[PDB]
Amino acid sequence: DTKVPRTGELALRRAIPANPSMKIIQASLEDISYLLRIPQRKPYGTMESNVKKALKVAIDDKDKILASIPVDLKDKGSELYTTLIDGKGGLQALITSIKKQDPDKVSLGLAASLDTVADLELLQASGLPQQYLNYPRLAGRGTVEITIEKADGSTFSAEAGGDQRKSATVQIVIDGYSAPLTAGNFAKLVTSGAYDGAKLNTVNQAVITEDGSGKVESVSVPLEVMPSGQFEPLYRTPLSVQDGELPVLPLSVYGAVAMAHSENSEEYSSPYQFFFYLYDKRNSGLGGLSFDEGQFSVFGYTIAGKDILGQIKTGDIIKSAKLIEGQDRLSLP
């Protein structure tokens, strides 16, 4: 129950707070996703056993699944549940495609079922310290779009579209469920335009902004790290991962986004400076965990545009940063 999410997408779906029935269904389906990627004769027997396990939990725990959904969302939840069982992209259809041994219909139904699982979990999640009572806070998820502009000489090269782009744009999903203070502060800065024009730098395995000394408040933002299997984040306290533990939002994911530490203390984040983490499992310690795992306030993951992070160079700028989803769930103060 403590593996390193291969992608920001998997990190984010595992981080959705949901009830144990959904987490068991989710993990069963995510196992199959992995199995489908193995260069071997497809293990359709193992796949079928896993989906049968997911279906049994989904049928047996129907009442618990819907009970965890708030009253006003139970109709939406009931419709998602029906799809999860009997929809064309649902669990019964998945067992059928596995029996047929058509790997591309299995892959499609698996993606559909995992999407429905995530939406059900988000419905449940929407139902879930005094010193920070008036701090900016993000409830739930946000999406921040960051456009990076290259120096007049240099160029981005995507697989799509253009081997000589002056600018490229990435999307970061930030997770207020697991990092409400850090994501909240980030969202406030983005919405105020504070990152528009900020310089970027490459230092070791990180793309880090200039420090915004002045030009914003110098608020005290405590370190914020939620150990997985616990139900509140720790504040001002790094998480030791030497004996099997892992944060709900691990740093050890390519394109993870975290705040730098404050200028005076490892117990606090910078009010402004953040970085993309260019995780490389070659440079890692025990269990492939970054040597910095559990030590920084991770608050989101780069999803769209992941592949241009490694092309950013010192002197590139954040042309603009904008909170394109979730601003209704940002509380100020």
UniProtKB/Swiss-Prot annotation:
Keywords: Chloroplast, Isomerase, Plastid, Rotamase, Thylakoid, Transit peptide. Induction: Up-regulated by light. Down-regulated by dark. The keyword Thylakoid applies. One of its GO terms (cellular component) is chloroplast thylakoid. It is found in: Plastid, Chloroplast thylakoid lumen. Its main location: plastid. Aerial parts. GO terms for molecular function: peptidyl-prolyl cis-trans isomerase activity. It catalyses: [protein]-peptidylproline (omega=180) = [protein]-peptidylproline (omega=0). Its EC number is 5.2.1.8. Residues 155-333 form the PPIase cyclophilin-type domain. PPIases accelerate the folding of proteins. It catalyzes the cis-trans isomerization of proline imidic peptide bonds in oligopeptides. This is Peptidyl-prolyl cis-trans isomerase CYP37, chloroplastic. It comes from Arabidopsis thaliana.
